[PDB]
Design a protein around this ligand. Structure first.
Ligand SMILES: C=C(O[C@H]1[C@@H](O)[C@@H](CO)O[C@H](OP(=O)(O)OP(=O)(O)OC[C@H]2O[C@@H](n3ccc(=O)[nH]c3=O)[C@H](O)[C@@H]2O)[C@@H]1NC(C)=O)C(=O)O
Ligand SMILES: CC(=O)N[C@H]1[C@@H](OP(=O)(O)OP(=O)(O)OC[C@H]2O[C@@H](n3ccc(=O)[nH]c3=O)[C@H](O)[C@@H]2O)O[C@H](CO)[C@H](O)[C@@H]1O
Ligand SMILES: [Mg+2]
Length: 419
């Protein structure tokens, strides 16, 4: 079982090329199920989640190929069920439900059980589909959606702001009969890209990025070539990494207007931030970060995907910092791990109180979150001594060659094959 052997402290410095967003390519790939023609998706990150989604697509009859881009061919989808064995490793699998029923009149997807980050029902998805005409049922764990002919456009208002359910409703609405309006929709950059992608295929969508997305059903979807946006999370992760190490870094292949909250939080912390059309520079000028307060929430607010990272930041910052989760009240696994490393923190419900310390100690930790767990690696880079990160399989899910990227920064990280 893979593991990380990290040794610090280390002052991160240098250059890094941000990969395509993981959370953009996922819904985009699932969206390709609709495409009736070959599709070329560019800038796809090399990561576990992508492997999983590619494999899933294959199970449906989709022709798949890959390098920097992914070659998708759905012309011959012959299967409509996403197997329990696969969904149980990636809840995102549910993304195949809407496209499948929207285009085929049918589709089945193992109903996702629990997740370590906490409660994550998919109620909004089904609900969203029913409103479109989908006749949905639950057989032996499988979500069975079925529609007689095309789906009908409807006026849907969302109980919660949900990236997942917005993509489900949006995507399926492209092939529906009539007009669909998603009120109280997610405004995540990844939603905008999934829509842009869809539009490129010949779909009719407006309002992407706003709280009101409008979809105009069409006959069918062609093929084409789309370019996935840069991963905002990766970037924020790299930025934080430099910011907690007194680093001086540059971000290539970026999109600054997706980090406003992170960017501002960083400046607040005390870093020197400059940005360009597709780049972002950060220089700590040899300074220890200043504690900051964070409140996760739907974009464009602070993203929970950066939450753990910022928690780390506060752990070694001067002052009392506060992190409050409003998206995943249980996304704290990292804390007890970082505390093993000499960190001081208190947990009160969805909030963690931070007490910065002068140093961190190398020790044995355990990853458990495909994104929060990165904080663990970041921790080992600035901590004193050797940190062994267990279960890095998590990180390989949301990070393309993370050790390589870190290494190009001066990090003393090594991958270990034998448990
Ligand atoms: C971890 C990762 O990233 C996830 C987080 O970044 C999250 C940010 O919210 O959004 C997406 O998951 P999500 O599941 O789609 O995100 P919500 O629907 O927005 O969930 C936000 C809140 O909404 C509740 N909710 C959601 C749907 C529903 O039907 N019912 C319902 O109650 C939910 O349980 C939360 O309490 C991301 N995953 C992907 C694959 O894109 C990762 O990289 O894998
Ligand atoms: C061998 C090992 O040590 N870990 C494996 C396990 O990682 P993990 O053990 O990290 O977990 P997982 O993703 O299977 O489960 C994460 C958490 O969710 C819970 N959960 C998960 C799925 C579900 O349908 N219901 C549910 O309740 C589970 O009890 C655990 O607390 O699985 C992965 C695929 O998923 C890989 O095979 C990992 O190598
Ligand atoms: Mg899991």
């Amino acid at each position: 079982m893979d593991k990380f052997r990290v040794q610090g402290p280390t002052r991160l410095q240098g250059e890094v090329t941000i990969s395509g967003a993981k959370n953009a390519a996922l819904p985009i790939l699932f969206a390709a199920l609709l495409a009736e023609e070959p599709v070329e998706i560019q800038n796809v990150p090399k990561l576990k989640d992508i492997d999983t989604t590619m494999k899933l697509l294959t199970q449906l009859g989709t022709k798949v190929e890959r390098x920097g881009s992914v070659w998708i061919d759905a012309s011959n989808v012959n299967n409509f069920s996403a197997p329990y064995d696969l969904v149980k490793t990636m809840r995102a699998s549910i993304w195949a439900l809407g496209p499948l029923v929207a285009r085929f009149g049918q589709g089945q997807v193992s109903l996702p059980g629990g997740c370590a980050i906490g409660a994550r029902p998919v109620d909004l998805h089904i609900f969203g589909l029913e409103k479109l005409g989908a006749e949905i049922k639950l057989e032996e764990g499988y979500v069975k959606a079925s529609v007689n002919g095309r789906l009908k456009g409807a006026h849907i208002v969302m109980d919660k702001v949900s990236v997942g359910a917005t993509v489900t409703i949006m995507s399926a609405a492209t092939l529906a009969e009539g007009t669909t309006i998603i009120e109280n929709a997610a405004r995540e950059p990844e939603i905008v890209d999934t829509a842009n992608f869809l539009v490129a295929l010949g779909a009719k969508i407006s309002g992407q990025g706003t709280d009101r997305i409008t979809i105009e059903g069409v006959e069918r979807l062609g093929g084409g070539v789309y370019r996935v946006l840069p991963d905002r999370i990766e970037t924020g992760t790299f930025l934080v990494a430099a910011a907690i190490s007194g680093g001086k870094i540059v971000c290539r292949n970026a999109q600054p207007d997706t980090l406003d909250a992170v960017l501002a939080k960083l400046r607040e912390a005390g870093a020197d931030i400059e940005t360009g059309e597709d780049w972002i520079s950060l220089d700590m000028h040899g300074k220890r970060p200043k504690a900051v307060t964070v409140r996760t929430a739907p974009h464009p607010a602070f993203p929970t995907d950066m939450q753990a990272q910022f928690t780390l930041l506060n752990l070694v910052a001067e002052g009392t910092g506060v992190i409050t989760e409003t998206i995943f009240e249980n996304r704290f696994m990292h804390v007890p791990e970082l505390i093993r490393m000499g960190a001081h923190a208190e947990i009160e419900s969805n909030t963690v109180i931070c007490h910065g310390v002068e140093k961190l100690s190398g020790a044995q930790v355990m990853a458990t979150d495909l994104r929060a767990s990165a904080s663990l690696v970041l921790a080992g880079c600035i901590a004193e001594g050797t940190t062994v990160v267990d279960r890095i399989y998590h990180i390989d899910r949301g990070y393309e060659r993370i050790e390589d990227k870190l290494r190009a920064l001066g990090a003393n990280i090594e991958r270990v094959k034998g448990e």
